[PDB]
Design a protein around this ligand. Structure first.
Ligand SMILES: OC[C@H]1O[C@H](O[C@H]2[C@H](O)[C@@H](O)[C@@H](O)O[C@@H]2CO)[C@H](O)[C@@H](O)[C@@H]1O
Length: 426
């Protein structure tokens, strides 16, 4: 729809703060800005944009955008050299796919260890001391650590610690065959998590809501989350600190670093308006500040604003974890990778499969990626659309046939002519 910007951003982000930026944009242009946070938007967009529908701007971590770009769902972004200098070169790299920029980087996201200072004035430096720490806190009706076990994003830093990896980058290229979800290190990490559940230090059904409510109500001492969660803890009675993730087997947790990015829809008739909004309103000190005050973005891509946020120990902790982790690849295979790990973690945690069986299944799934789940139903969506045409065509032939020939139009008479065999049966 023309003369209008529709924006999709995840529900855990500051969509209200982003909406305020849109109203300032609307104040200056008269162009309404609608900000929405539909669930599973990173799955909807590749489907709805396949038929030229969806939002003008989509917000997500950069790791999904290579799939969109490969599918040709993204418009060209054209920041000049001057604008690119405003942002970190490595954040541009995160949104660079096959030498081509496919999205605007907004903020750098990395998981951190969040802890209750009143419950735990000095948080554990290692994963290893958490079991004994939980037993101690159970005696006081508390628990040590609760975090989202339904999303592999939260468990991957432990998995990758002793040698787990997704895609390696050598000779200026990813080896998409070389996936390391089933090795010694991945097994050691996932086994430890599973053992935590077997020894009743955690529960496999723990998701985002449960862990959040538990920590913010002072029921658990620690949690693992991103900057976006800080706002909800502020409103609670918990005195919390943000610190480096615990090490595993002497080695640091390696969280997948995500760069929140804003892509422009290829079907959007407002590509210039979207550029103006992103470059001159959002990606400014004032624009990012508005979003950040709602839900913390973390380490923003804009250098000028990040220089002020950098003094925040929470941000410093976020970057400390980011530096010990790897940037997420943006290649299309990332979607299939995450699906394999999610299934493996959930199946192993719930006890349905063992660690080795679950990770073997993940590795085999990694050997069998093609095409992406998103690619499959979007392609199906096209086929369902063309199917609609055949029925609609069938509807008009029978409709025209009910009309008197002397009252039929030129088109109706012409369309009826090239369906002689169908008309005769009708
Ligand atoms: O768990 C798989 C999932 O990991 C990442 O998603 C994160 C996202 O980056 C964060 O911003 C957070 O707020 O939401 C997700 C954690 O549940 C990948 O970006 C995503 O593509 C992937 O499916």
């Amino acid at each position: 729809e023309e003369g209008k910007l529709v924006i999709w951003i995840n529900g855990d982000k500051g969509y209200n703060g982003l909406a305020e930026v849109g109203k300032k944009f609307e104040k200056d242009t008269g162009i309404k800005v609608t900000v929405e946070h539909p669930d599973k938007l990173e799955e909807k967009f590749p489907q709805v944009a396949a038929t030229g529908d969806g939002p003008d701007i989509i917000f997500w971590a950069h790791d999904r955008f290579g799939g969109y770009a490969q599918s040709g769902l993204l418009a060209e972004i054209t920041p000049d050299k001057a604008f690119q200098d405003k942002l970190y070169p490595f954040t541009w790299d995160a949104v660079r796919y096959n030498g081509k920029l496919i999205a605007y980087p907004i903020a750098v996201e990395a998981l951190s260890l969040i802890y209750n200072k009143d419950l735990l004035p000095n948080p554990p430096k290692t994963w290893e001391e958490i079991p004994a720490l939980d037993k101690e806190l159970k005696a006081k009706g508390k628990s040590a650590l609760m975090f989202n076990l339904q999303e592999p994003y939260f468990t991957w830093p432990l998995i990758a610690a002793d040698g787990g990896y997704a895609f390696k980058y050598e000779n200026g290229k990813y080896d998409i065959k070389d996936v390391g979800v089933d090795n010694a290190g991945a097994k050691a990490g996932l086994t430890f998590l599973v053992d935590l559940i077997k020894n009743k230090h955690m529960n496999a059904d723990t998701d985002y809501s449960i862990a959040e409510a538990a920590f913010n109500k002072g029921e658990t001492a620690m949690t693992i989350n991103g900057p976006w969660a800080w706002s909800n803890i502020d409103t609670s009675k918990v005195n919390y600190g943000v610190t480096v993730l615990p090490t595993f087997k002497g080695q640091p947790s390696k969280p997948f670093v995500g760069v929140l990015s804003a892509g422009i829809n290829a079907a959007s008739p407002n590509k210039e308006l979207a550029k103006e909004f992103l470059e001159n309103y959002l990606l400014t000190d004032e624009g990012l500040e508005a979003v950040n005050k709602d839900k913390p973005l973390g380490a923003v891509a804009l250098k000028s604003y990040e220089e002020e946020l950098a003094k925040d120990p929470r941000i410093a902790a976020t970057m400390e974890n980011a530096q010990k982790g790897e940037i997420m690849p943006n290649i299309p295979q990332m979607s299939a990778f995450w699906y394999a790990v999610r299934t493996a973690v959930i199946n192993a945690a719930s006890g349905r499969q063992t660690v080795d069986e679950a990770l073997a299944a993940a590795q085999t799934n990694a050997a069998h990626m093609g095409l992406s789940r998103s690619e499959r139903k979007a392609a199906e969506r096209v086929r369902r659309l063309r199917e609609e045409q055949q029925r609609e065509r069938l509807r008009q032939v029978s409709r025209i046939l009910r009309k008197a020939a002397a009252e039929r139009s030129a088109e109706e008479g012409r369309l009826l002519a090239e369906s002689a065999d169908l008309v005769t049966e009708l």
